[PDB]
């Protein structure tokens, strides 16, 4: 079942990247 | 007698950039550089002749230029044996003296001469923004290159012959008579795939194809030069290009880098225009020679087949072991023993010739393996032997030069486009194109 844990971690990281790209905080 | 940094705006390290507008200085620079090229050619030829012994094959002492003359077929006997050395000496000395003449001309034009040729010599003058004169110069030089190609064809077909490595009983000088002028085969190479087993234009096998291609390219070059002399660029051509000196340099850099990469691959793989007898065996050739010599020795001593043979994914019979990656190799000493279905057993069982055996031995011993420290053999070789195949030198040097000239294309094309647009010096700090855009959220 370790495989599912690895995929969960990778997909979560990809989600963090996506959110950092498209949902940026406007300056000040 | 150069300009100042303030006058031209270019520092010393960007000095030659001051010559863009000036024509006489640029012309002298070009002529002097051509003289330098020819000087190096002559000097290298003389030195290589001075350090050459006809007894040994040329690839054993690091020879890179003399193999070219040998390929043209000067002082070369059957099997690659050296007959006379005078042709090389005469070629070198002629090159060197022509270089002297070119250097004198370039120095005269660069130092004491009209800095701009437009005012006094309208025929030779030009302006980068001009289009007709650029086409005229291009046509002149296209005609020159076509004449060179036709000179090669004339030499191959008349007044001697070229060293064909596919002649029966080893290579020898031969006179071409019926070059393959069919357009279909000529352009099949241009359309051929570049991947394993196809190789694009690097898969030419017969000198017939070489001569036919040179005929076609020379005729096309002459016609194109005549066309460009009398023609002006089309409206779309003037709309898709940047017409300035640096842009011309950029396109030339891109083209020459691509040709450098292509020549590197040709040197590493091709063996027809580069006979193995002079340059030495290629990597695949050395591996196949290893396998073939081992099979011959095993067959002699013991006296598909499990001994060093196997079946390729397609189905043909191929040499076994790690050599299977080179199953597409073709060579004069291996072609006769190959049947329609790859290697046929009866051929090696009966059809064997001594010269093939000794050629295979001499090729397997001299594999294209070496070190930058001029020590042959694998990197983990305990002892020391001096050998590095000239093919490796050519391939590495020309790959590096092609890559660097591609980078040069990138740089110069970017700079030329920016200068044409008018913002190469920097942002105007008043009307930033970014400021005229909405904020990005």
């Amino acid at each position: 079942m370790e495989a599912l844990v690895y995929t969960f971690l990778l997909v979560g990281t990809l989600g963090i990247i996506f959110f950092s790209i498209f949902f940026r905080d406007p300056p000040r | 007698g150069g300009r100042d940094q303030e006058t031209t705006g270019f520092a010393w390290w960007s000095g030659n950039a001051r010559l863009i507008n000036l024509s006489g200085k640029l012309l002298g620079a070009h002529v002097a550089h051509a003289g330098l090229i020819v000087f190096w050619a002559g000097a290298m030829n003389l030195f290589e002749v001075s350090h050459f012994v006809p007894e040994k094959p040329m690839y054993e002492q690091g020879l890179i230029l003399l193999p070219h003359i040998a390929t043209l077929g000067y002082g070369v006997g059957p099997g690659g044996e050296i007959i006379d050395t005078f042709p090389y000496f005469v070629s070198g000395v002629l090159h060197l003296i022509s270089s002297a003449v070119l250097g004198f001309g370039g120095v005269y034009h660069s130092l004491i001469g009209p800095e701009t040729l437009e005012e006094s010599y309208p025929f030779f003058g030009y302006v980068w923004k001009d289009k007709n004169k650029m086409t005229n110069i291009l046509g002149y030089h296209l005609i020159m290159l076509g004449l060179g190609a036709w000179l090669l064809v004339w030499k191959a077909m008349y007044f001697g012959g070229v060293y064909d490595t596919w002649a029966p009983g080893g290579g020898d000088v031969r006179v071409i008579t019926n070059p393959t002028t069919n357009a279909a085969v000529i352009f099949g190479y241009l359309v051929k795939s570049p991947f394993g087993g196809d190789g694009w234009i690097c898969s030419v096998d017969n000198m017939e194809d070489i001569i036919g291609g040179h005929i076609w390219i020379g005729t096309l070059e002459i016609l194109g030069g005549i066309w460009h002399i009398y023609t002006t660029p089309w409206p779309w051509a003037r709309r898709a290009f940047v017409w300035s000196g640096e842009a011309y340099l950029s396109y030339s850099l891109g083209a020459i880098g691509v040709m450098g990469f292509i020549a590197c691959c040709m040197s590493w793989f091709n063996n027809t225009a580069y006979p193995s007898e002079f340059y030495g065996p290629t990597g695949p050739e050395a591996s196949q020679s290893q396998a073939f010599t081992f099979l011959v020795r095993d067959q002699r001593l013991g006296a598909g087949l499990g001994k060093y043979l196997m079946r390729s994914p397609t189905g043909e019979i191929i040499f076994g072991g790690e050599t299977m990656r080179f199953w597409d190799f073709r060579g004069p000493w291996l072609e006769p023993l190959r049947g329609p279905n790859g290697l046929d057993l009866n051929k090696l069982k009966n059809d064997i010739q001594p010269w093939q055996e000794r050629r295979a031995a001499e090729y397997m011993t001299h594999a294209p393996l070496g070190s930058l420290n001029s020590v042959g053999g694998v990197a983990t070789e305990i002892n020391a032997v001096n050998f590095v195949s000239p093919r490796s030198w050519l391939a590495c040097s020309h790959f590096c030069l092609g890559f660097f000239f591609f980078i040069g294309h990138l740089w110069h094309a970017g700079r030329a486009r920016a200068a044409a647009a008018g913002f190469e010096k920097g942002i105007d700090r008043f009307d930033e194109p970014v400021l005229s855009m909405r904020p990005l959220d």
């Binding site: - | 779309w236 940047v242 044409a420 647009a421 008018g422």
Partner: protein
């Protein structure tokens, strides 16, 4: 897999043609301020 080969070929050719014609559409650079 002839069908897949033709599908890949048509999509690749579409992309390449759009790329080439897109560059062909762009008008030349120029300096208004000169």
């Amino acid at each position: 897999m002839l069908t897949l080969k033709i599908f890949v070929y048509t999509v690749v050719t579409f992309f390449v043609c759009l790329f080439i014609f897109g560059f062909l559409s762009n008008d030349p650079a120029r300096n208004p301020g000169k």
